[PDB]
Amino acid sequence: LHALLRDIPAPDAEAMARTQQHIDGLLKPPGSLGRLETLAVQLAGMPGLNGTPQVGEKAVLVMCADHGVWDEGVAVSPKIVTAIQAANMTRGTTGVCVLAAQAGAKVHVIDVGIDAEPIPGVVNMRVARGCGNIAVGPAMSRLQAEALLLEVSRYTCDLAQRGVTLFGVGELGMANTTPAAAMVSVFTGSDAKEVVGIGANLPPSRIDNKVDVVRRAIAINQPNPRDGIDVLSKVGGFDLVGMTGVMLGAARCGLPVLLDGFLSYSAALAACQIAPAVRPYLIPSHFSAEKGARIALAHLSMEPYLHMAMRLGEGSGAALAMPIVEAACAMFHNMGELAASNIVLP
Amino acid sequence: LHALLRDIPAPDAEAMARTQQHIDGLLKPPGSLGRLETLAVQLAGMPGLNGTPQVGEKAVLVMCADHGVWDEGVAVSPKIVTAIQAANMTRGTTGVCVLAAQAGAKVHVIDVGIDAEPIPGVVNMRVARGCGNIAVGPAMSRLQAEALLLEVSRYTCDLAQRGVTLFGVGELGMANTTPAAAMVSVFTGSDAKEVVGIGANLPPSRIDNKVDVVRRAIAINQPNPRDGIDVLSKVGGFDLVGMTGVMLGAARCGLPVLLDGFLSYSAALAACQIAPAVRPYLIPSHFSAEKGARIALAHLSMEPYLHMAMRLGEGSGAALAMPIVEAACAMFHNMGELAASNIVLP
Ligand SMILES: O=C(O)c1cccnc1
Ligand SMILES: O=C(O)c1cccnc1
Ligand SMILES: Cc1ccc(O)cc1
Ligand SMILES: Cc1ccc(O)cc1
């Protein structure tokens, strides 16, 4: 793990310089394609991409798990939905499933701790049957967090070996916006009220309780903000841990990862805390409708491309942005050149 | 034309109601897919779509034309670029070309007034060899505007008859951000300084002159803000007129049109002024980096989906958003249902 972290590659400045010059010479006013140009340069710098913006196979990894905090009344969805939806992921009837198919991406469903019997067809990496109730203690042990990080990381890099060049990250876990808010609060130093949202349609009345739960979780566990693994283990969840693991894995592999929504921002903060070297590999997708989104994104210094007021999760936002990534590549490779048209600008 | 305007259909509220109920029953928390749901309902209301959100063939119409105002020193691009780029559109090496191919859309290049010899392969609807210099008089005659509107409108609806169900609108015309700013200024009642941008890399120094040119255009022509055709003819251009014509045509045909950037916002204001019934058919794509974008969008009451800091034009933003439209349809048609999973929410 320290090995893993040690070996994350830095971005290739040389490839990026070559990319930039190439972009500048395309059939358009310089810088006219804005963020699409910056994206292309970013990709070019990723070692697993072979010095150029390109997209081979795509995969969306969905981390599923239950949370003990559900018992605190922080979520209106029945606990069982996690298990139900996880099975549905195998049938391709879910939101991320539908959106991934549209993008030509494959969905990988991973059970990191669903509180139900095992689901056939789902990748089994179950830590336990749901994590500890963060309100009265830690979600899990540091050892448990570390091992899962390690395990997911490896699975991720392994896909790389099979042609995957672009990852998307997602989750499924009733009550998960609670640990996400706790993490955000801790990493950003924001007060709970500021970052706690309605999650999946939590009634306006029930909010106060959700805020109290987050505060309690923090007070009781005393997570250390300067220690990402400490935070994850104390006030996070298996699903959150798994997402962080994808990010660590893609970076080590020198490949890009598309973030999703709120839950993913939490995991990204953790990952960046654990290894800043991870940052350059992250790509935002959309701007989650969760209340704490703005704060979390500010701390990641990220500006999403899509404003869809989405708040479903599952990696649906990630899938939706994949075409944008492919667009930047298309632009890079298929546009003509100014010089070829004898076009001279100032 | 008055016929044309008379016959624009209202949206089908019945289809929309059915759509909404269907969306609500999908495998997700109600309203969780945000703008993707609203988009789907919007499409369902469009009569040319047959009561459901669907996408058949797609086309991006690019209106090309030169402007006399170029002579005022408002643009750094050589005048000839219009003609050059128009030809390039036939070769598929341009930005919109590359992005359309990615979206599976076909690009239609239409010459409405390029100041050069005719370009083989380009649809010929040339009004004149460039429009009048708006700084000292009108861009064209009202008759000329009306006829072009009519002609483009028809061409548009005709494509419908060949399976096209989704349009994208774009332009190509050196100096065109000048008439666009004038129109915006006039329709919104904003001062020129507020809406005049750098267009295609206009040097910061040269801005003042661009602002003076817009003011002059307005003072001299005295366009009537309550008369969209009056504005277009006086301070617009052939390309701007053509874009408005696409919007009028798609609406009459009961089909959706994706807007592009700044230039397209100008045309949209005109179209809405001319026929408010057009509004429900318009779909924003991205948020142009042009200075006057925010003001123009506010007046259209639109919030784009994509924030890419793009400012190329050509309909590139339109092409880039097409996948989003297809996503809303995919969502609508391919997701499973709550009831089927025995999922009951509050
Ligand atoms: O932004 C998200 O990903 C999200 C928001 C609410 C509930 N679940 C997921
Ligand atoms: O927003 C646009 O479409 C645009 C901005 C600048 C120059 N040309 C087009
Ligand atoms: C130089 C240039 C190229 C393309 C375009 O659409 C405008 C200007
Ligand atoms: C009810 C539900 C459905 C999907 C999902 O991802 C979350 C909750």
XYZ file of C-alpha atoms and ligand atoms in Angstrom:
726
model
C 0.000 0.000 0.000
C 2.763 2.387 0.804
C 4.362 0.735 -2.215
C 1.274 1.383 -4.181
C 1.209 4.990 -3.119
C 4.892 5.374 -3.766
C 4.625 4.210 -7.322
C 1.902 6.580 -8.618
C 3.416 8.204 -11.687
C 3.727 11.880 -12.232
C 2.135 13.290 -15.379
C 4.223 13.432 -18.553
C 4.997 17.091 -19.159
C 6.695 16.296 -22.420
C 3.622 14.633 -23.903
C 1.499 17.528 -22.646
C 3.719 20.086 -24.319
C 3.448 18.174 -27.614
C -0.262 17.946 -27.155
C -0.658 21.618 -26.550
C 1.275 22.605 -29.657
C -0.795 20.208 -31.731
C -4.041 21.623 -30.418
C -2.921 25.116 -31.103
C -2.414 24.230 -34.769
C -5.921 22.941 -35.368
C -8.496 24.524 -37.656
C -9.863 27.027 -35.142
C -8.961 30.166 -33.283
C -6.485 29.308 -30.605
C -8.096 28.340 -27.303
C -11.548 28.484 -28.901
C -12.502 24.974 -27.797
C -11.815 25.927 -24.135
C -12.188 23.119 -21.603
C -12.139 20.545 -24.376
C -8.548 21.578 -25.080
C -7.538 21.525 -21.457
C -9.110 18.122 -21.097
C -7.164 16.733 -24.072
C -3.892 18.042 -22.644
C -4.717 16.487 -19.322
C -5.258 13.087 -20.856
C -2.050 13.328 -22.884
C -0.155 13.696 -19.656
C -1.459 10.308 -18.314
C 1.213 7.626 -18.707
C -1.212 4.740 -19.156
C -2.490 6.583 -22.264
C 0.614 6.411 -24.317
C 1.356 10.113 -24.877
C -1.873 11.028 -26.499
C -5.499 11.654 -25.651
C -7.213 8.370 -26.387
C -10.025 6.214 -25.134
C -10.064 2.449 -25.486
C -12.462 0.478 -23.359
C -14.528 2.099 -20.615
C -15.810 0.710 -17.343
C -17.984 2.007 -14.555
C -17.195 0.433 -11.172
C -20.111 0.489 -8.733
C -19.347 -0.077 -5.042
C -22.244 -1.451 -3.017
C -22.591 -1.567 0.732
C -24.883 -1.007 3.681
C -24.375 1.351 6.611
C -25.288 0.903 10.291
C -26.165 4.585 10.456
C -29.316 3.742 8.562
C -30.740 2.899 11.977
C -30.441 6.559 12.987
C -33.380 7.474 10.733
C -31.190 9.404 8.255
C -32.695 7.710 5.142
C -36.188 7.164 3.806
C -35.235 4.368 1.437
C -35.771 0.878 2.798
C -32.471 -0.776 3.726
C -33.170 -3.636 1.353
C -33.045 -1.370 -1.664
C -29.249 -1.770 -1.710
C -29.518 -5.497 -2.266
C -32.401 -5.105 -4.686
C -30.699 -2.493 -6.810
C -27.429 -4.411 -6.768
C -29.225 -7.358 -8.377
C -30.888 -4.963 -10.844
C -27.435 -3.797 -11.865
C -26.881 -7.314 -13.138
C -29.998 -6.984 -15.306
C -29.025 -3.648 -16.835
C -32.277 -1.924 -15.888
C -30.696 0.681 -13.648
C -29.888 4.299 -14.385
C -26.131 3.849 -14.615
C -26.686 0.704 -16.638
C -28.791 2.522 -19.186
C -26.423 5.453 -19.366
C -23.319 3.261 -19.583
C -24.802 1.314 -22.508
C -25.436 4.604 -24.210
C -21.702 5.486 -23.698
C -20.496 2.023 -24.646
C -19.112 1.416 -21.170
C -19.315 -1.750 -19.096
C -20.640 -1.749 -15.604
C -18.872 -3.688 -12.871
C -20.961 -4.245 -9.739
C -18.934 -4.862 -6.660
C -20.255 -5.894 -3.330
C -18.031 -4.461 -0.614
C -20.499 -4.944 2.243
C -24.189 -5.341 1.428
C -26.228 -6.579 4.386
C -27.910 -9.489 2.650
C -26.989 -12.798 1.171
C -24.515 -12.775 -1.671
C -25.875 -11.831 -5.088
C -24.971 -14.020 -7.955
C -23.316 -12.088 -10.745
C -21.977 -9.433 -8.424
C -18.201 -9.201 -7.770
C -17.692 -10.359 -4.223
C -15.331 -8.290 -2.054
C -17.568 -8.132 0.972
C -15.993 -6.816 4.101
C -18.918 -7.378 6.354
C -22.686 -7.332 6.293
C -22.913 -3.539 6.455
C -20.414 -1.234 8.271
C -20.582 0.004 11.888
C -23.034 2.772 12.862
C -20.818 5.830 12.717
C -23.049 7.598 15.183
C -21.771 5.517 18.097
C -18.413 4.335 16.898
C -16.284 3.738 13.840
C -17.564 2.314 10.598
C -14.703 -0.225 10.537
C -11.118 -0.952 11.522
C -8.129 0.733 9.910
C -6.930 -2.687 8.858
C -10.222 -3.323 7.133
C -9.986 -0.025 5.300
C -6.424 -0.600 4.203
C -7.091 -4.085 2.931
C -10.131 -3.031 0.940
C -8.202 -0.114 -0.550
C -5.533 -2.548 -1.573
C -7.953 -5.055 -2.983
C -10.000 -2.583 -5.031
C -6.849 -0.813 -6.282
C -5.550 -4.044 -7.665
C -8.806 -5.016 -9.309
C -8.807 -1.632 -10.977
C -5.260 -1.792 -12.392
C -5.986 -5.350 -13.499
C -8.806 -4.117 -15.751
C -6.266 -1.868 -17.353
C -4.438 -4.952 -18.490
C -7.566 -5.896 -20.429
C -7.897 -2.716 -22.531
C -9.785 -0.464 -20.145
C -8.448 3.062 -20.425
C -11.199 5.076 -18.800
C -12.847 4.517 -15.500
C -15.967 5.878 -13.964
C -16.742 5.477 -10.334
C -20.073 4.943 -8.569
C -21.854 3.580 -5.464
C -25.053 2.114 -4.105
C -25.806 2.207 -0.342
C -28.897 3.459 1.462
C -27.966 6.167 4.000
C -24.587 6.772 2.336
C -24.980 10.572 2.084
C -24.592 10.688 5.840
C -20.992 9.386 6.030
C -20.249 11.431 2.902
C -21.321 14.610 4.617
C -19.268 13.691 7.698
C -16.153 13.215 5.589
C -16.729 16.447 3.732
C -17.243 18.308 6.946
C -13.994 16.889 8.326
C -11.835 17.381 5.285
C -13.048 20.905 4.554
C -13.573 22.100 8.106
C -17.128 23.094 7.256
C -19.920 22.836 9.727
C -22.331 19.932 9.304
C -25.343 22.129 8.643
C -23.526 23.508 5.602
C -22.814 20.208 3.965
C -25.712 18.015 4.957
C -28.265 17.506 2.129
C -31.573 15.729 1.465
C -29.888 12.705 -0.035
C -32.594 10.574 -1.581
C -35.583 12.717 -0.873
C -35.185 13.110 2.843
C -38.100 15.234 4.143
C -37.211 18.764 5.141
C -38.320 18.071 8.690
C -35.938 15.115 9.153
C -32.888 17.222 8.295
C -32.088 18.409 11.763
C -31.711 14.849 12.896
C -29.360 14.075 10.023
C -27.206 17.073 11.039
C -27.133 15.952 14.647
C -26.066 12.456 13.543
C -23.108 13.812 11.573
C -21.918 15.951 14.461
C -22.245 13.026 16.808
C -20.247 10.838 14.467
C -17.474 13.371 14.437
C -17.449 14.101 18.145
C -17.410 10.450 19.050
C -14.790 9.221 16.607
C -12.505 12.200 16.505
C -11.258 11.464 13.032
C -7.970 13.074 12.074
C -8.403 15.269 9.022
C -4.807 14.973 8.114
C -5.179 11.213 7.869
C -7.466 10.174 4.976
C -7.422 6.545 5.989
C -8.318 7.553 9.544
C -11.271 9.519 8.334
C -12.531 6.845 5.962
C -12.347 4.141 8.599
C -14.062 6.124 11.293
C -16.750 8.085 9.610
C -16.821 6.657 6.073
C -18.184 3.313 4.738
C -17.134 0.292 2.629
C -18.634 1.799 -0.464
C -16.750 5.106 0.151
C -13.567 3.171 0.785
C -14.004 1.174 -2.410
C -14.461 4.353 -4.517
C -11.269 5.793 -3.068
C -9.610 2.491 -3.978
C -10.656 2.904 -7.615
C -9.070 6.315 -7.709
C -5.899 5.024 -6.148
C -5.804 2.130 -8.579
C -6.372 4.186 -11.727
C -3.703 6.639 -10.723
C -1.137 3.971 -10.027
C -2.034 2.543 -13.429
C -1.576 6.056 -14.874
C -5.171 6.263 -16.081
C -8.073 8.700 -15.835
C -11.125 8.393 -13.633
C -14.347 10.233 -14.000
C -15.933 11.337 -10.741
C -19.703 11.057 -10.224
C -21.631 13.081 -7.639
C -21.539 13.941 -3.926
C -20.516 10.546 -2.650
C -17.654 10.515 -5.134
C -16.469 13.960 -4.097
C -16.105 12.671 -0.515
C -13.986 9.724 -1.732
C -11.946 12.038 -3.854
C -11.090 14.244 -0.892
C -9.887 11.169 0.972
C -7.853 9.967 -1.955
C -6.181 13.322 -2.412
C -5.402 13.486 1.275
C -3.910 10.036 1.174
C -1.994 10.761 -2.040
C -1.911 14.124 -3.672
C -0.337 12.488 -6.675
C -3.803 11.189 -7.393
C -5.209 14.588 -8.307
C -4.059 14.895 -11.899
C -5.881 11.717 -12.845
C -9.319 12.862 -11.645
C -11.886 14.270 -14.037
C -15.116 15.834 -12.814
C -18.379 14.904 -14.560
C -21.397 16.729 -13.201
C -22.432 19.144 -10.504
C -24.467 17.181 -7.917
C -27.671 18.712 -6.564
C -26.594 17.722 -3.032
C -26.296 20.777 -0.748
C -22.652 20.153 0.136
C -21.535 19.836 -3.495
C -20.167 23.377 -3.929
C -17.992 23.172 -0.827
C -16.628 19.770 -1.667
C -15.781 20.782 -5.270
C -14.111 23.975 -4.115
C -11.792 21.986 -1.964
C -11.001 19.692 -4.886
C -10.569 22.818 -7.019
C -12.802 21.240 -9.659
C -15.437 22.675 -11.964
C -17.762 20.059 -13.415
C -18.708 20.059 -17.077
C -22.363 19.117 -16.656
C -25.092 20.968 -14.808
C -27.992 18.521 -14.734
C -29.219 18.809 -11.152
C -28.615 15.119 -10.832
C -28.581 13.286 -7.521
C -29.106 9.636 -8.295
C -25.588 8.316 -7.840
C -24.614 4.824 -9.127
C -22.028 6.416 -11.322
C -24.754 7.796 -13.612
C -23.053 11.237 -13.925
C -19.741 9.506 -14.721
C -21.322 7.557 -17.563
C -23.006 10.652 -18.880
C -19.669 12.493 -19.177
C -17.825 9.735 -21.033
C -18.826 11.105 -24.412
C -17.173 14.353 -23.485
C -13.907 12.562 -22.942
C -14.236 10.893 -26.314
C -15.011 14.278 -27.854
C -11.733 15.758 -26.700
C -9.912 12.828 -28.301
C -11.871 13.141 -31.524
C -11.093 16.795 -31.649
C -7.374 16.077 -31.106
C -7.131 13.378 -33.694
C -9.568 14.224 -36.404
C -9.547 17.957 -36.950
C -7.612 19.502 -39.839
C -4.755 22.051 -39.441
C -4.576 25.763 -39.963
C -1.366 25.540 -41.947
C -2.877 23.073 -44.333
C -5.492 25.670 -45.195
C -2.980 28.447 -45.418
C -4.801 30.120 -42.631
C -2.629 32.568 -40.791
C -3.805 34.240 -37.634
C -2.195 36.669 -35.220
C -44.737 33.470 -43.478
C -47.580 34.722 -41.398
C -49.069 31.364 -42.350
C -45.957 29.681 -41.204
C -46.013 31.540 -37.935
C -49.691 30.898 -37.492
C -49.315 27.179 -37.806
C -46.631 26.532 -35.145
C -48.122 23.874 -32.895
C -48.520 24.173 -29.200
C -46.900 21.475 -27.074
C -48.922 18.362 -26.255
C -49.782 18.584 -22.571
C -51.388 15.184 -22.636
C -48.240 13.444 -23.849
C -46.224 15.385 -21.273
C -48.476 14.280 -18.449
C -48.082 10.645 -19.551
C -44.378 11.140 -19.798
C -44.095 12.577 -16.354
C -45.986 9.726 -14.724
C -43.808 7.216 -16.539
C -40.631 8.906 -15.392
C -41.830 9.005 -11.860
C -42.234 5.221 -11.895
C -38.681 4.439 -12.937
C -36.102 2.643 -10.818
C -34.858 5.698 -8.928
C -35.884 8.198 -6.316
C -38.393 10.542 -7.817
C -36.828 13.579 -9.479
C -33.347 12.150 -8.900
C -32.322 12.450 -12.547
C -33.113 16.213 -12.472
C -32.719 18.048 -15.776
C -32.638 14.760 -17.648
C -36.240 14.213 -16.559
C -37.326 17.700 -17.460
C -35.670 17.317 -20.822
C -37.513 14.051 -21.535
C -40.849 15.651 -20.658
C -40.055 18.552 -22.913
C -39.388 16.298 -25.860
C -42.558 14.292 -25.231
C -44.530 17.467 -25.651
C -43.165 18.036 -29.228
C -45.753 16.969 -31.805
C -43.242 15.939 -34.460
C -41.948 13.370 -31.928
C -45.002 11.248 -31.693
C -45.832 11.527 -27.977
C -42.594 10.245 -26.647
C -39.005 11.312 -26.153
C -37.188 9.893 -29.144
C -34.346 10.697 -31.468
C -34.197 9.496 -35.052
C -31.792 11.182 -37.405
C -29.831 14.279 -36.409
C -28.583 17.181 -38.483
C -26.505 20.250 -37.810
C -27.323 23.162 -40.132
C -24.464 25.628 -40.573
C -25.291 29.071 -41.984
C -22.402 30.806 -43.723
C -22.133 34.438 -44.685
C -19.920 37.499 -44.765
C -20.555 40.874 -43.151
C -19.710 44.379 -44.408
C -18.937 45.402 -40.844
C -15.724 43.452 -41.163
C -14.352 46.623 -42.734
C -14.771 48.432 -39.409
C -11.811 46.527 -37.940
C -13.999 44.495 -35.542
C -12.381 41.120 -36.447
C -8.846 39.790 -36.597
C -9.673 36.821 -38.798
C -9.071 37.365 -42.495
C -12.344 37.801 -44.387
C -11.517 34.858 -46.613
C -11.639 32.435 -43.721
C -15.420 32.196 -44.181
C -15.038 30.812 -47.676
C -12.116 28.625 -46.678
C -13.842 27.107 -43.687
C -17.059 26.621 -45.635
C -15.149 24.432 -48.096
C -13.499 22.622 -45.165
C -16.960 21.801 -43.871
C -17.391 19.745 -47.015
C -14.238 17.795 -46.132
C -15.268 17.041 -42.556
C -12.085 18.444 -41.025
C -13.784 21.175 -39.035
C -14.674 21.261 -35.362
C -18.412 20.832 -35.828
C -17.728 18.162 -38.415
C -15.619 16.153 -36.018
C -18.061 16.582 -33.175
C -21.099 15.787 -35.326
C -19.501 12.536 -36.520
C -18.920 11.648 -32.915
C -22.687 12.245 -32.254
C -23.778 10.500 -35.434
C -25.219 13.707 -36.849
C -24.975 15.010 -40.400
C -23.726 18.444 -41.169
C -25.499 20.615 -43.719
C -23.464 23.593 -44.932
C -25.539 26.393 -46.280
C -24.262 29.434 -48.018
C -26.582 32.345 -47.292
C -24.164 35.082 -48.362
C -20.448 34.298 -48.483
C -18.440 36.950 -50.320
C -16.643 34.644 -52.719
C -17.442 32.424 -55.621
C -19.854 29.596 -55.003
C -18.447 26.523 -53.273
C -19.229 23.208 -54.768
C -20.875 20.889 -52.285
C -22.335 23.717 -50.261
C -26.130 24.304 -50.266
C -26.684 27.478 -52.215
C -29.146 29.997 -50.748
C -26.980 33.039 -51.237
C -28.657 36.342 -50.706
C -25.767 38.486 -51.705
C -22.001 38.539 -51.565
C -21.880 39.567 -47.906
C -24.479 41.793 -46.131
C -24.422 45.600 -45.750
C -22.068 47.246 -43.225
C -24.363 47.741 -40.264
C -22.235 50.606 -39.059
C -23.517 52.933 -41.778
C -26.816 51.405 -42.727
C -28.862 48.234 -42.654
C -27.474 44.789 -43.271
C -30.263 44.073 -45.790
C -33.847 44.769 -46.800
C -36.846 43.503 -44.855
C -37.928 41.667 -47.970
C -34.584 39.932 -48.123
C -34.870 38.894 -44.500
C -38.391 37.598 -44.885
C -37.602 35.584 -47.972
C -34.550 33.969 -46.425
C -36.525 33.131 -43.287
C -39.104 31.508 -45.480
C -36.588 29.630 -47.545
C -34.565 28.256 -44.627
C -37.734 27.357 -42.686
C -38.915 25.238 -45.542
C -35.599 23.506 -46.043
C -35.655 22.654 -42.368
C -39.165 21.144 -42.276
C -38.319 19.274 -45.470
C -35.485 17.441 -43.695
C -38.051 16.325 -41.194
C -39.769 14.466 -43.975
C -36.576 12.448 -44.383
C -36.287 11.137 -40.801
C -34.512 14.024 -39.114
C -35.938 14.519 -35.647
C -33.278 16.634 -33.999
C -31.686 19.764 -35.262
C -28.639 21.653 -34.222
C -27.931 25.116 -35.425
C -24.625 26.802 -36.277
C -22.876 29.562 -38.275
C -19.668 30.637 -39.944
C -18.998 34.341 -40.697
C -15.983 36.466 -39.824
C -17.041 39.529 -37.789
C -20.399 37.955 -36.892
C -20.103 38.587 -33.127
C -20.575 42.259 -33.882
C -24.141 42.049 -35.270
C -24.873 39.451 -32.581
C -23.924 41.874 -29.856
C -26.017 44.608 -31.498
C -29.072 42.362 -31.546
C -28.544 41.307 -27.965
C -28.150 44.873 -26.877
C -31.388 45.805 -28.643
C -33.494 42.899 -27.515
C -32.362 43.024 -23.893
C -31.946 46.768 -23.530
C -28.402 46.263 -22.292
C -25.658 48.685 -23.048
C -23.160 47.676 -25.726
C -20.195 47.616 -23.372
C -21.984 44.921 -21.373
C -22.570 42.556 -24.226
C -19.636 43.100 -26.525
C -17.010 40.301 -26.319
C -13.641 39.340 -27.825
C -15.210 37.144 -30.462
C -12.415 35.227 -32.125
C -9.501 36.486 -30.136
C -9.990 40.182 -30.611
C -7.162 42.010 -28.779
C -8.167 43.762 -25.591
C -7.117 47.089 -27.053
C -9.427 46.800 -30.087
C -12.514 46.363 -27.906
C -13.421 49.988 -27.561
C -13.725 50.268 -31.293
C -15.992 47.232 -31.439
C -18.247 48.845 -28.800
C -18.368 52.100 -30.718
C -19.315 50.199 -33.891
C -22.266 48.510 -32.184
C -23.576 51.777 -30.789
C -23.220 53.403 -34.164
C -25.107 50.572 -35.802
C -27.947 51.045 -33.389
C -28.071 54.819 -33.527
C -28.030 54.867 -37.288
C -30.563 52.137 -37.983
C -32.926 52.656 -35.109
C -34.077 49.073 -35.058
C -37.386 48.419 -33.343
C -36.947 45.961 -30.499
C -40.513 44.912 -30.658
C -40.034 43.827 -34.253
C -37.658 40.836 -34.553
C -37.625 40.993 -38.318
C -36.834 44.707 -38.130
C -33.910 44.058 -35.876
C -32.527 41.174 -37.910
C -32.695 43.118 -41.148
C -31.093 46.240 -39.797
C -28.423 45.121 -37.447
C -28.237 41.355 -38.026
C -26.755 39.330 -40.946
C -27.677 36.560 -43.427
C -26.153 33.935 -41.221
C -28.138 35.236 -38.183
C -31.281 35.326 -40.280
C -30.721 31.773 -41.483
C -30.306 30.459 -37.898
C -33.566 32.111 -36.896
C -35.114 30.427 -39.938
C -34.002 27.010 -38.682
C -35.677 27.654 -35.375
C -38.845 28.792 -37.056
C -38.809 25.763 -39.319
C -38.230 23.184 -36.586
C -40.986 24.648 -34.486
C -43.492 24.648 -37.297
C -42.484 21.035 -37.890
C -43.006 20.417 -34.150
C -39.393 19.387 -33.595
C -36.564 20.262 -31.217
C -33.553 22.417 -31.953
C -30.375 22.567 -30.010
C -28.890 26.034 -29.646
C -25.126 26.576 -29.956
C -23.309 29.606 -28.535
C -23.504 33.413 -28.549
C -24.462 33.853 -32.167
C -27.268 31.350 -31.690
C -28.568 33.113 -28.601
C -28.974 36.295 -30.682
C -30.986 34.381 -33.317
C -33.042 32.788 -30.624
C -34.021 36.152 -29.172
C -35.179 37.232 -32.617
C -37.117 34.054 -33.162
C -38.869 34.328 -29.828
C -39.731 37.933 -30.528
C -41.126 37.007 -33.894
C -42.992 33.993 -32.495
C -43.131 33.169 -28.851
C -44.596 29.830 -29.791
C -41.081 28.930 -30.817
C -39.748 28.853 -27.269
C -40.829 25.396 -26.174
C -38.901 23.800 -29.012
C -35.522 25.322 -28.097
C -32.943 23.385 -26.125
C -29.784 25.020 -24.813
C -26.460 23.196 -25.249
C -23.522 25.017 -23.718
C -22.611 28.221 -21.962
C -20.581 30.346 -24.420
C -17.449 32.099 -23.171
C -18.574 35.282 -24.965
C -19.004 38.194 -22.520
C -22.648 38.813 -23.408
C -23.678 35.176 -22.910
C -25.132 35.524 -19.394
C -27.367 38.437 -20.349
C -28.619 36.807 -23.498
C -29.416 33.508 -21.707
C -31.197 35.315 -18.900
C -33.506 36.892 -21.377
C -34.171 33.504 -22.958
C -34.642 32.129 -19.438
C -32.311 29.261 -20.322
C -29.667 27.416 -18.342
C -27.241 25.470 -20.507
C -26.217 21.932 -19.649
C -22.547 22.225 -20.583
C -19.910 24.521 -19.145
C -16.947 24.113 -21.482
C -15.806 27.698 -21.993
C -16.316 27.152 -25.671
C -16.371 29.956 -28.213
C -15.731 28.384 -31.578
C -19.221 28.430 -33.042
C -20.072 26.355 -36.168
C -22.653 24.511 -34.172
C -19.916 22.672 -32.246
C -21.703 23.105 -28.862
C -24.949 21.846 -30.436
C -23.255 18.679 -31.649
C -21.628 18.148 -28.300
C -25.006 18.188 -26.512
C -26.734 15.703 -28.811
C -25.699 12.754 -26.684
C -27.458 14.352 -23.770
C -30.685 14.384 -25.707
C -30.239 10.730 -26.554
C -29.523 10.024 -22.891
C -32.864 11.395 -21.785
C -34.570 9.120 -24.309
C -32.551 6.107 -23.226
C -33.426 6.797 -19.658
C -37.135 7.062 -20.561
C -37.248 3.920 -22.601
C -34.777 1.542 -21.106
C -34.888 1.861 -17.348
C -36.802 -0.650 -15.226
C -39.734 0.240 -12.897
C -40.003 0.574 -9.169
C -43.163 -1.495 -9.001
C -41.534 -4.339 -10.824
C -38.972 -4.515 -8.043
C -41.554 -4.167 -5.343
C -39.839 -1.023 -4.313
C -42.116 1.267 -2.398
C -41.053 4.753 -1.467
C -42.780 7.613 0.310
O -24.813 13.224 -5.820
C -25.003 11.983 -5.607
O -24.229 11.128 -6.111
C -26.161 11.524 -4.733
C -27.021 12.511 -4.125
C -28.054 11.967 -3.338
C -28.304 10.640 -3.097
N -27.390 9.779 -3.719
C -26.348 10.166 -4.511
O -20.173 31.494 -28.744
C -19.953 31.425 -29.996
O -20.693 30.717 -30.729
C -18.802 32.202 -30.617
C -17.983 33.042 -29.777
C -16.953 33.712 -30.465
C -16.672 33.650 -31.806
N -17.548 32.824 -32.521
C -18.583 32.113 -31.985
C -9.840 30.800 -37.956
C -11.226 30.226 -37.770
C -11.426 28.853 -37.908
C -12.702 28.298 -37.717
C -13.786 29.119 -37.411
O -15.028 28.565 -37.245
C -13.584 30.503 -37.281
C -12.308 31.060 -37.465
C -34.922 3.819 -4.612
C -33.525 3.906 -5.184
C -33.285 3.465 -6.483
C -31.999 3.558 -7.040
C -30.945 4.074 -6.288
O -29.692 4.142 -6.838
C -31.187 4.510 -4.975
C -32.473 4.423 -4.418
